[PDB]
Amino acid sequence: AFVRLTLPPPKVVDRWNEKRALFGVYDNIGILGNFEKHPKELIKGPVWLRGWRGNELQRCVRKKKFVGNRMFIEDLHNLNKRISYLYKHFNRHGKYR
Amino acid sequence: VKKGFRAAFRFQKELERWRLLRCPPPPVRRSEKPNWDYHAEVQAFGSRLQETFSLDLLKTAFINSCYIKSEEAKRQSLKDNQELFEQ
Amino acid sequence: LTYCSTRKGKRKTVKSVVHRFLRLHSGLWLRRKAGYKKKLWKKSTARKKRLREFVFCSKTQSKLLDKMTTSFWKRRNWYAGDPYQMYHDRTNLRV
Amino acid sequence: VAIWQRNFRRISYANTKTRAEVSGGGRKPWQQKGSGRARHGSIRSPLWRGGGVAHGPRGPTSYYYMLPMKVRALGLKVALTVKLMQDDLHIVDSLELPTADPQYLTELAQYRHWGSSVLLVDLTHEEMPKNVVAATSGLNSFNLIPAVGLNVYSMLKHQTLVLTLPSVAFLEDKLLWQDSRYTPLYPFRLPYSDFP
Amino acid sequence: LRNRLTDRYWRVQEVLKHAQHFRGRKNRCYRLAVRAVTRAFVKCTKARRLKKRNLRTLWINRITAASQEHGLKYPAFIVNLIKCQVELNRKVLVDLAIYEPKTFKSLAALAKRRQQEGFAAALGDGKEPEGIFSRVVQYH
Amino acid sequence: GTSLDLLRSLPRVSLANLKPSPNSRKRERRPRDRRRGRKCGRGHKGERQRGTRPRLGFEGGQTPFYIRIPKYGFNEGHSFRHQYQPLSLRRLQYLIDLGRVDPTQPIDLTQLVNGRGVTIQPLKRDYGVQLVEEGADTFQAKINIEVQLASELAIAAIEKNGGVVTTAFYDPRSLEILCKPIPFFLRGQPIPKRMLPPESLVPYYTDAKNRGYLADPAKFPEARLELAMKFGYVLPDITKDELFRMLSARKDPRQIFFGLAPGWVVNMADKKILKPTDENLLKYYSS
Amino acid sequence: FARRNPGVVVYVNPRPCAMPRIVAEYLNGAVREENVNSKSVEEIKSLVQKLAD
RNA sequence: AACGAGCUUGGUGAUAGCUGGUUACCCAAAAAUGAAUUUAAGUUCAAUUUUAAACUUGCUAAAAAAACAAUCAAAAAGUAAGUUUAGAUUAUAGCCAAAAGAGGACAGCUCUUCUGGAACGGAAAAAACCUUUAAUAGUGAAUAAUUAACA
RNA sequence: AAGAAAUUCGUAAGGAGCUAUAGAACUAGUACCGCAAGGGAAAGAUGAAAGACUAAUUAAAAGUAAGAACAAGCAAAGAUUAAACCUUGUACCUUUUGCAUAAUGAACUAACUAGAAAACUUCUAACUAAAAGAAUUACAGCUAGAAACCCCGAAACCAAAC
Ligand SMILES: [Mg+2]
Ligand SMILES: [Mg+2]
Ligand SMILES: [Mg+2]
Ligand SMILES: [Mg+2]
Ligand SMILES: [Mg+2]
Ligand SMILES: [Mg+2]
Ligand SMILES: [Mg+2]
Ligand SMILES: [Mg+2]
Ligand SMILES: [Mg+2]
Ligand SMILES: [Mg+2]
Ligand SMILES: [Mg+2]
Ligand SMILES: [Mg+2]
Ligand SMILES: [Mg+2]
Ligand SMILES: [Mg+2]
Ligand SMILES: [Mg+2]
Ligand SMILES: [Mg+2]
């Protein structure tokens, strides 16, 4: 194989930037705040998987439910095919029955 | 262009061996190299042989006429071992 | 068996089991004797007596049905006047 | 709790196309036999340069889970003791400072032997003194949070912890309520006979 | 390409560094070197327990040569030396012949005498005092 | 403590020092090594190794075991059978002992659930709580308990100690509000009427011996006395008892809560109760 | 160790470092260096005694 | 420019009980018999095997006596395993020697039953016969089968 | 295999992503290929200044050269004063029965290229006749964590264009 003939540039991480310093604050907003807000409400992400977890087939179906009607034609077609592939895998294949 | 700094580092040392071994540098006295104190090493020399030595006398033995002349010239720009050699 | 259903993503009960077997909460399964309604005119009286009974399932058969039914069919049911009230528990069994 | 404060938020956006989503690869490249080459049904397969990944990251993934309410509350109690016993917790009446100059706060920490990184907790965000607000904002290591925002991860990252007296009472009631309580008949936010 | 092996260079080096002295493409190609090296390691392991049997066969050749100079077959030399209660392994006997020829003659004569004594004992039946060297010391 | 003292000596706790509890995690075996690679645990070449073996319950082609047994009605009508979460007298006495039920006040399904004495799931066909005979001997408490189903011996324990036991029917809609009142008040809808029992349950709740709420008041005395003779105790005089009004308290057959009439609205935010003045609505609610 | 072997000059040079390293010099001029990264005191003590012998 | 029925795109990552492949170390235990199957290039169950747990007798042997060299088995003794419970597969074609039946109350041949084996040592040949309790460093040692026969 | 509803509940700029065989097919729907529908690439790398004669950087892949060969043999190992002579040794994988002198597959190098899910079980904790941040389960349970089930390949079938 081949390896670099020079050392790559040093990578410097500032561990006291604002994002890292205050990471985690308000994770106990509920228990310490009279349960006004559940901590799951603080997650920033796709609408269909805020405060939710599942396997890919479940993830595929959940993406369709929330934004199935606002998706592009090609993206929706690929999602439908992705669901049908996963369905036959998880429900008809695998070592265990 | 793969990730990481470590793979380059291991190879940089591989480059080190290639250059040094193919074109070795001229020998350098152990004094110039790190981890050298004259007095401590002199003490160990006597202990290693198991023979008690007079440290001051042993120091003069290692001194040579050539070394003195070079030092004096550098200073411009401490007794020899000749008597010990004869005895 | 549907291990992950499209609409909900859950396991699906096989209804062929729900219509043939009864599960007691301990883990036992009840069943009928195949043919207990068939050609009774040529079966001996002792033979017919055996068929009318309710029979238990083995460890393997019980294990199978537990894979083909969902937890809802494995819960506690507090039916008033249940004729299977006393049979949902095992007593004086050391094993 | 420390791992929880890492994972539940996590959402990963790494994604790789599969062999069907890759552009092209519809026609069969060549006949099975007669050419002396291996049998392929699409120029976009996992065995082909430019093909689709075999088992790669798919879509956005979520790592969301919540520990039980008592478990996460217990973590706060544990973290509080650890700082106290190791002489990292300092109890203060109020956060009032003589001057807003950040230099004073940094110098004071060294004089009192506090750690480089200090976490300051006040009862409520709205009432916090203006003098502290100016000083802490200019300082990276000295991070100021309100009482309700206390978390295990913050305490672990910060060497010393400064607690105001009212905040200690606030934390003491909240955590000690978690034990001696029933199991919620409802979501707690709904009206309760004896809960604020 | 999220994760790729950045140190595969040294993994190949481990196999290749054990193949330089070979001839042909096996000394430089990993697909070919690796197969060659395994056999080299296996033979090295199956030859650690063959130099302990050949080195003994070498000794028997040289002891057979040594005794024959003095007129004794190998079986007679070794057996009689033991029967005299003197225990010398086949490694020093070869050393003695090569570097101490005069001492070996003493061993050859001593082994020969016991052989004669053994022949006399069988030839002469009955209660007779055995040869001076025939006498066997006992340890309790 | 002594264990706490050790922590003081040890170095500062930080994010680097974190360790999972012993044996909490397991090694995840991957297929990259000889033991777990190559054939990768799937055996030789075959259907099960190609990943495409048949479904569960498929016995090779003979009629499967689960399909070859006669269908029987063990589970027929299960979703419509009535469930009563039973309550024993040991649990009742145990709850009263620890101060999680107020015996002086009348007891109902709401105050059982509030004190977590019982757990009720209306969505799973629960129709209330049935009192059970277990623990009668240890029961020495006088209490006015309302339970949808009662038993002969359970009644004896309540009556012998000088208590009132009544049985009332709550329909699926009524039960949900009874177990969980507060949210219903948050919905903003008016309180509903409580429907009478269906034909199947009419005989039970109109029977004097079962202490039915719709039962004839006149026949109670005789029924109690006959039970008193049967179990060898003398009927106590509740009227003489100081708390006769509380014990005798019984909600209207169309009432979910003792002190609230159908059709009212509760405003928790303003701390007020709103009652309709419309004659038409009053007619409907009064019914 | 220093007193037990008085013919072995011992240099200890604590520095900001990633791997602790022991360098052994013999009288014939041969050098030998062994990595001590994350080794307990028991391992080092046994390791050093091999070098002296 | 290969028509028993064109070609291109899409369905489509068609499906394949079939062929091929499936990437670090170390320690340990470890088998092609019975049943059903559009079944005999497959699967499922029994039997075997295995990881854990529970608690107590298990293996060889087993006198008399039965039912006739076995089916059964009591005191013993030599010895450490056996039963129950929970979880889980792969496997379901053998190969060769030596014994004994049974097919035409034959040898053979095809089956069936019991026994053994899978060297680096030996037997012109040499996975199957004979000597061989695991694997480790040593320029130690005693040995096994065998190294043909002298009728 | 499919699968409700009634009825409850809700105010909602970032990257433990890729970095030239990766990420889009893309420097481009271009070159090229097909009458047409249509299919479909590859690659680049100096410095602050080139109005400083385009840098660097590397025993580093296969392949060669420098330097053809010298009785004898899976090409090595034990060795040895000595490179070869002497002794020992039936390529690898898959595969067949647990055997190959078989039969498949590999000219060599670099990069890429195949095990994925939590019903039941085990292990680890929180609280405990109760556990769960609403609907769930309970005759010691309940909650949370960790722990699992691949890749490539037909002849075909249908729709719509050409
Ligand atoms: Mg496609
Ligand atoms: Mg096509
Ligand atoms: Mg295909
Ligand atoms: Mg791609
Ligand atoms: Mg896995
Ligand atoms: Mg059939
Ligand atoms: Mg319930
Ligand atoms: Mg068998
Ligand atoms: Mg078939
Ligand atoms: Mg088949
Ligand atoms: Mg590209
Ligand atoms: Mg491309
Ligand atoms: Mg080269
Ligand atoms: Mg040779
Ligand atoms: Mg080839
Ligand atoms: Mg396939």
Phi, psi dihedrals of residue D118, rounded to the nearest 5°: -125, 135
d(CA E108, CA C30): 96
Q: Percentages helix, strand, coil for chain B, rounded to the nearest 5?
A: 60, 0, 40
Supply angle C-alpha C59, C62, C64, rounded to 5.
110
Tell me the H-state helices in chain F: 2-9, 47-50, 89-97, 109-114, 152-160, 172-179, 181-187, 202-205, 220-230, 244-248, 279-286
Among F41, F42, F51, beta carbon nearest to A93: F51
Of C53, C17, C14, C10, nearest to C34 by C-alpha is C53
Q: What is the DSSP letter of G35?
A: E
Contacts of D23 (CB under 8 A, 6+ apart): D44
Which H/E stretch holds residue D163?
Answer: strand D160-164
Going by their DSSP bridges, the two strands C22-23 and C29-31 should be labelled as: antiparallel
Closest residue, by C-alpha, to the C1' of H53: C95
Give Cα C8 to chain centroid, integer Å.
Answer: 26
For F223, the 3-state DSSP assignment is: helix
Q: Is F156 in contact with F167 (CB distance < 8 Å)? A: no
Alpha-carbon dihedral sign for residues F257, F258, F263, F269: negative
d(CA A37, CA D189): 9
Of F87, F89, F113, nearest to F100 by C-alpha is F113
Alpha-carbon dihedral sign for residues E121, E127, E128, E133: positive
For D121, the 3-state DSSP assignment is: strand
Q: Is E85 in contact with E136 (CB distance < 8 Å)? A: yes
Contact B4 E10 (CB under 8 A): no
d(CA D13, CA D59): 7
Is G29 within 8 Å of chain B by CB?
no
Q: Is D170 in contact with D97 (CB distance < 8 Å)? A: no
Residue F243 burial (CB count, 10 A): 13
Strand H nucleotides, any atom under 7 Å from protein beta carbons: they are 8-28, 35-39, 41-46, 84-92, 120, 137-142
Going by their DSSP bridges, the two strands F83-84 and D160-164 should be labelled as: unpaired
Q: Is F141 in contact with F103 (CB distance < 8 Å)? A: yes
Both tokens assigned to B36: 């050298």
Chain C residues whose beta carbon lies within 8 Å of the beta carbon of residue F86:
78
Alpha-carbon dihedral sign for residues D187, D190, D191, D194: positive
Burial class (CB in 10 A: 0-12, 13-18, 19+), D6: middle
- In angstroms, what CA-CA distances link F68 with E12, F62, F177? 62, 10, 46
For F166, the 3-state DSSP assignment is: strand
Of C19, C45, C44, nearest to C32 by C-alpha is C19
d(CA D136, CA D117): 11
Give Cα E19 to chain centroid, integer Å.
Answer: 30
Q: What is the DSSP letter of A47?
A: G
Residue A22 burial (CB count, 10 A): 16
d(CA A49, CA D62): 7
d(CA D89, CA D73): 19
d(CA D105, CA D180): 40
* DSSP letters spanning F99-142: TSS-TTSPB-HHHHHHTTS----GGGTEEE-BB-STTTTT----
Q: D76 beta carbon < 7 A from strand I?
A: no
Burial class (CB in 10 A: 0-12, 13-18, 19+), D75: buried
d(CA F5, CA F236): 63
Give chain C's end-to-end CA distance (angstroms, integer): 33
d(CA A69, CA A63): 10
d(CA C29, CA C58): 8
Contact A54 C2 (CB under 8 A): no
d(CA D50, CA D25): 10
F274 Cα–ligand 11 center, Å: 72
Q: F55 beta carbon < 7 A from strand H?
A: no
Supply angle C-alpha G15, G20, G22, rounded to 5.
110
Is C36 within 8 Å of chain F by CB?
yes
Of E87, E93, E88, E89, nearest to E139 by C-alpha is E87
* DSSP letters spanning E99-129: H-HHHHHHHHHHHHHHHHHHHHHHHS-SS-P
Chain E residues whose beta carbon lies within 8 Å of the beta carbon of residue A4:
none
Q: Is D147 in contact with D169 (CB distance < 8 Å)? A: no
Strand partners, D89: D161
Q: Cα Rg for chain G, rounded, in angstroms?
A: 12
Is A11 within 8 Å of chain F by CB?
no
| Amino acid in the structure at residue E6 | T
Q: Name the neighbours of A, counting chains with at least 3 Cβ pairs within 8 A.
A: B, C, D, E, F
Give Cα D59 to chain centroid, integer Å.
Answer: 23
Sort residue F85 into left (φ over 0), alpha (ψ -120 to 50) or beta.
beta
Contacts of D65 (CB under 8 A, 6+ apart): A53, D4, D7, D8
Contacts of B35 (CB under 8 A, 6+ apart): G11, G13, G23
Residue of chain F whose alpha carbon sits nearest to that of C73? F75
Contacts of C19 (CB under 8 A, 6+ apart): F71, F72, F75
Of D125, F69, F130, E90, nearest to C82 by C-alpha is F130
- In angstroms, what CA-CA distances link D31 with D6, D27, D35, F136? 53, 11, 8, 86
* DSSP letters spanning D1-63: -TTHHHHTT-EE------TTTSS---S-SS-SSSSSS---S-SSSTTSTT---SS---S-EE-
Q: Is D52 in contact with D18 (CB distance < 8 Å)? A: yes
d(CA E110, CA E102): 13
- Residue bearing tokens 């069988």: E122
Q: What is the DSSP letter of F282?
A: H
Going by their DSSP bridges, the two strands F165-166 and F265-267 should be labelled as: unpaired
F touches E, CB cut-off 8 Å, minimum 3 pairs:
no
CA distance B63 to chain E (A): 47
Hits for CB < 7 Å against strand I across D residues 173-192: 179, 182-190
- Torsion angle (degrees, nearest 10) of CA C61, C64, C70, C72: 20
d(CA F135, CA F137): 6
Both tokens assigned to C65: 């049905």
Q: Is D82 in contact with F10 (CB distance < 8 Å)? A: no
Alpha-carbon dihedral sign for residues E123, E127, E128, E129: positive
Resolution in A: 3.6
Going by their DSSP bridges, the two strands F272-274 and G21-25 should be labelled as: unpaired
Q: B7 beta carbon < 7 A from strand I?
A: no
Give Cα C68 to chain centroid, integer Å.
Answer: 12
Contact D186 F4 (CB under 8 A): no
Q: Is A61 in contact with A79 (CB distance < 8 Å)? A: no
d(CA F198, CA D159): 69
d(CA C13, CA F59): 19
